[PDB]
Design a protein around this ligand. Structure first.
Ligand SMILES: Nc1ncnc2c1ncn2[C@@H]1O[C@H](COP(=O)(O)OP(=O)(O)OP(=O)(O)O)[C@@H](O)[C@H]1O
Ligand SMILES: [Zn+2]
Ligand SMILES: [Zn+2]
Lengths: 146, 310, 146, 310, 310
């Protein structure tokens, strides 16, 4: 293939510059197996894409839901014994828990031992995320302000 | 079993038209026939980490009038949270092993929903959380509106004030949007405007609302005029241009009002309603405050009694 | 396995794990050039290594040296049109400016708009770093923070 | 021009035995033969952003005693840095276009080096940057040590007190490590022990140092006993166990002291040197203080004069 | 005697194009040929009842650079006005019997005019009276503008920032309105817009001014871009929305700037001029700051000398 793994995931079609944030977000560096990261590769329709290839490793649920909110274009390909057993494009979940931080400075989530949680309303314009606690709804742009 | 037995009363969004109506019918009943020992042998906590005259005192008197005992605190200053640095999560865990219901007021938005993750089986009733929700207030306002208009449908409601940080109007609009054909007119400083998430919800239900620069332009159309206070304690320094009330109701403005129109206010009131309005047939905010006893007696009755027969 | 490049820099023989740390510490991913990172590659010379190829980018002698602080055994191979034109190996830089922050809480560097600089000194186990401004020496482990 | 002309004097670690010796000889010249016009038409800024009596006033009297004019401040509060929030770097940038030399005292370590970048061509003389360096102090202590023991090489020196934040002992241990065969005895509490980097440097030069738990241990051996103050202002809350000086020195102790031994203190002195020591032949610290006039005007004269003073 | 001898310098509105031109020529003379004894035997008071770095220190260095002696205070706290409650008028009345000229900075608007009544024959030079005037600033800005653009007439000048409390822009707009065909672009937030009376005066003289919402709008046209600081200390609580400078200037913006354009700032600078501008050919504000030495000693020399300096 353009590289090759017996078992593993290849996350293709990642937007330019998101690739590295993803590596960091999903703590994919804490591993011992082969990883190939192709930063800023061609992708005809949108020119630059990033490509991560983790050998003999698959993404847990949460990461695939996060992936939906960070890189919707991306396609997770389940490879087993070089066969692309599956190719799946993420869809937005109902709720995102414990990685998002609430824009509301006076939220209770900040000061107390609780996992944050956000409800995902897919607005026609963008993703509206509603905090579990303070009940404010925010633009996903605001919420993902890195 | 009644549908509100053991529930947490946190946000208006979690209660239906039916639960609201059940509290009001009960409320009217307790008003007609007092129940002095309906909560005999129950101890309830009144946990106020933010300032209150009405919500705290009305609740504590409702508890007494139904025969419960009360324990609590008027300020966190003296608790092991305020002095020894205990988390609110631990504060609720232990208080839940002592009492039957916890009523709490708190400065940060979401503290009541937080409390429920820790209270175990004990019902938490939200007395106000920062600028988010105030469900018990809404219930005594719906009782007052019912009482004076004989309907909770097809009214003309105007909300005047700091609509941004007013937990009272955030709960009240969500509750009235559960009734048929209610029209809304919002008069606020734009920097203290109504939150877009309530607005979206109203558009989603196909309710009609409008923005206005003055009270006189809507006066002759409204059934209820709902005045609010500028929440100084919540204002960001950028908003200090907005501390003194922009729209002040003076008795002379009511000249073209519907005879039935009622002037409501959560209270405290600062400069926004001139005391001369107090002498008119339209002023109803102290009646409303009084009505808090029946609404809160009704709520408590329902949460702690599996079946009420009254 | 990895990729064939035209012209640029291939930093080879990076101790496994450190490869990502280098890409974050020096802004190597902040570019529009194509990069191919191979984390956890069989080396033999070492069990596992990491490798980084940057197409159409070159490093300067100070840049290469800066790498010695994490990867002294790395060979920065210079490539001009598919030819190995140079093989550079990192010496200790006598000073590192801009990338590191002083652990001295009351150092002026924190309050003023100046770039950091630490004098490097090989002491007797690890590397000792002298802050230019407050003049305290700290272990290079410590300066890499927590 | 003489070796130090237009030079910044920020740390002892950048001067040579040669430089140090030159400043002291100009000092002995100047002490012997005053030059009142030596800096006639020069304006120096005295910028102290931290407290002082000695350093700032001896510096300003030295400038006047050479004919120069002094402008400046002794408090940060009323500068535009104090009230209007400007950066130190911009402070130094405008001040550089007014004066010929800047004497600066500042509470963060590295402030005077930060100022050299922005002073353009104007020399910066460090009057103390936090707990790091105090090179001016070191020059008057070396003038006094040479003036009493005859030499600066092969001396026995005990430094007692807060060696961790003692800007004075940090620079003086670096200056005496540039002379032959000087012996060091460091008596400090653990928490406030001599900084490691100083010790490494001592080891590299093969300078012998030894830690001691008592003044009586070193008393019979020492030529110079250099006492310091616990830098109260700089202590972390953890270190508040030791704020009172563990080592206090009373006249009684001097029973087994060498008749040449001098007791030096940078001053202020708080509890550590008991007033009864002030009448012994050994007490020299007030003398040391006054020797600041000479060492200071020798430095100023070299830095602003091309021609070596006679 | 020369036109400004013994004159008070309180506001730009009382000076003529003639006076302004005279001060600048003395400045260029003095810059070229220093007169160190020009004020030998004069004592000036430097009375600053408000914070400063530039004004007070450049003024005191200018007095020293002409041979004069400076007495005064930089803080009100330790005067008998500060602690004992005396009136400013009595302060000025006793100070008048000691010095030959008073430089005064004060937080109320009109303080320096108040002082002229009580100074008897002693000239008062205004160093900034609240948000009103700062005539000294205006004289060094005009020296710098002439020094860079060659002329003071037919210039394009944009003043950006807090024009409402900018004592600096109030006086400088009055000074440039005394020269021919100067064009004004005022970029401020509404709340901190240019005072009306300035604008009336501009209209009377047929001076063209225009308000703009962006630096990019004026960039290609402007000769002098004069940036100001939001006078934080002077803002009413209502105005606290705008404390951060709406207009911040980064190096990128200079892409379509005329190769003669100079960026001037009175300083302190806080967020509004991004450090990257400090390496462009356009950045001149530190130069402007230093030009304060010359403009200041030219003013002092005219006011205390009968004979025009050469
Ligand atoms: N033009 C090129 N394009 C891509 N990779 C190249 C190119 N030239 C060299 N490399 C890479 O850089 C490294 C250079 O290998 P080299 O030319 O030194 O032969 P070698 O046997 O690997 O010697 P060594 O073991 O010391 O590296 C290899 O990892 C190779 O992938
Ligand atoms: Zn929240
Ligand atoms: Zn430092």
């Amino acid at each position: 293939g353009v590289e090759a793994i017996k078992r593993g995931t290849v996350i293709d079609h990642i937007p330019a510059q998101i690739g590295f944030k993803l590596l960091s977000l999903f703590k994919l560096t804490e591993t011992d197996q082969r990883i190939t990261i192709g930063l800023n590769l061609p992708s005809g329709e949108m020119g630059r894409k990033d490509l991560i290839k983790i050998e003999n490793t698959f993404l847990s649920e949460d990461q695939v839901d996060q992936l939906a909110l960070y890189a919707p274009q991306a396609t997770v390909n389940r490879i087993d014994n070089y066969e692309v057993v599956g190719k799946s494009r993420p869809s937005l979940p109902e709720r995102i828990d414990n990685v998002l931080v609430c824009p509301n400075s006076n939220c209770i989530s900040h000061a107390e031992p609780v996992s944050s949680s956000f409800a995902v309303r897919k607005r026609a314009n963008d993703i509206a995320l509603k905090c579990k606690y303070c009940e404010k709804e925010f633009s996903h742009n605001v919420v993902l302000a890195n | 079993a009644n549908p509100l037995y053991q529930k947490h009363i946190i946000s208006i969004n979690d209660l239906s038209r039916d639960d609201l109506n059940l509290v009001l019918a009960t409320a009217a009943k307790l008003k007609a026939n007092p129940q002095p020992e309906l909560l005999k042998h129950k101890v309830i906590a009144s946990c106020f980490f933010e300032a209150s005259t009405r919500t705290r005192l009305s609740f504590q008197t409702s508890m007494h009038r139904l025969g419960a005992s009360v324990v609590g605190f008027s300020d966190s200053a003296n608790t092991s949270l305020g002095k020894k640095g205990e988390t609110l999560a631990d504060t609720i865990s232990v208080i839940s092993t002592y009492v039957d219901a916890i009523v709490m007021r708190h400065p940060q938005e979401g503290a009541a929903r937080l409390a429920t993750e820790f209270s175990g089986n004990v019902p938490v009733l939200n007395a106000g959380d920062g600028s988010n929700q105030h469900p018990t207030q809404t219930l005594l306002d719906l009782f007052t509106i019912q009482q004076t208009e004989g309907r909770l449908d097809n009214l003309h409601v105007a909300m005047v004030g700091d609509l941004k940080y007013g937990r009272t109007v955030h709960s009240l609009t969500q509750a009235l949007a559960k009734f048929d054909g209610n029209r809304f007119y919002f008069i606020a400083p734009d920097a203290l405007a109504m939150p877009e998430y309530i607005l979206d919800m109203l558009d989603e239900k196909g309710i009609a609302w409008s923005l206005h620069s003055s009270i006189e332009e809507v006066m002759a159309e409204v059934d209820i005029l709902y005045m609010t206070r500028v929440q100084k304690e919540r204002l960001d320094p950028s908003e200090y241009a907005n501390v003194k009330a922009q729209f002040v109701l003076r008795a002379s403005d009511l000249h073209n009002a519907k005879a039935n129109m009622k002037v409501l206010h959560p209270l405290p009131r600062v400069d926004e309603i001139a005391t001369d309005v107090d002498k008119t047939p339209h002023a109803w905010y102290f009646q409303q405050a009084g009505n808090g006893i029946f609404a809160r007696q009704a709520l408590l009755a329902l949460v702690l009694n599996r079946d009420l027969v009254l």
